[PDB]
Design a protein around this ligand. Structure first.
Ligand code: MK1
Ligand code: CL
Lengths: 99, 99
């Protein structure tokens, strides 16, 4: 699709076998999902936003589907106020910002 | 142009007559610029991101140029880590997210 930006560019994702809504975020380097149970090994990380930092669980090689695109990438899980799809996955689905 | 997302989507902006670099951010509702001297009336506001909220100066009806595209909009100024161009201005220059 070509997504206009009058509202938040939200898409449906599947992660850990669960359907969720997430924000396509060109300003985010990484993909960060709200606190959930996810199976697998992980390692701690801290990531920085506009209001400071949060601690997350970094999961490598996680299967995730984004607006029907089947992907495999690193997914961070932590106390983000919104599910965020960042550049690591925007690149996998071939997204571009056009003007 | 059409900007891929292998790298941060950084562009040159002009604000207050001064050239700066900024991030085109579809995940940002608003536009927030690092602390700078900008003429004009303003009022305080809070904006929230990962990590919490920050207090900024809200300037209404500010002229700004984004990668050669002029626009007039609300611009926030405060202790943001990076200059961010949000949806309020992305929509004004006709930007879309495509995949
Ligand atoms: C990987 C991670 C997600 C942590 N990235 C960010 O938070 C980066 C941080 N940098 C900075 C950075 C910090 C440290 C290291 N490298 C980079 C600045 C830009 N953000 C990207 C933003 O797009 C993220 C969104 C998330 C969000 C959306 C809706 C509601 C809550 C949170 C964001 O912060 N948006 C907020 C926002 C932003 C600007 C203006 C107004 C508003 C309101 C709101 O839309
Ligand atoms: Cl859960």
């Amino acid at each position: 699709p070509q997504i206009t930006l009058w509202k938040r560019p939200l898409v449906t994702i599947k992660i850990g076998g669960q359907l969720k809504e997430a924000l396509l975020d060109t300003g985010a380097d990484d993909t960060v999902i709200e606190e959930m149970s996810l199976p697998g090994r992980w390692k701690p990380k801290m990531i920085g936003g506009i209001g400071g930092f949060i601690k997350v669980r970094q999961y490598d090689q996680i299967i995730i589907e984004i607006a029907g695109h089947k992907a495999i990438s690193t997914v961070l899980v932590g106390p983000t106020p919104v599910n965020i799809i960042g550049r690591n996955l925007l690149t996998q689905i071939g997204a571009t910002l056009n003007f």
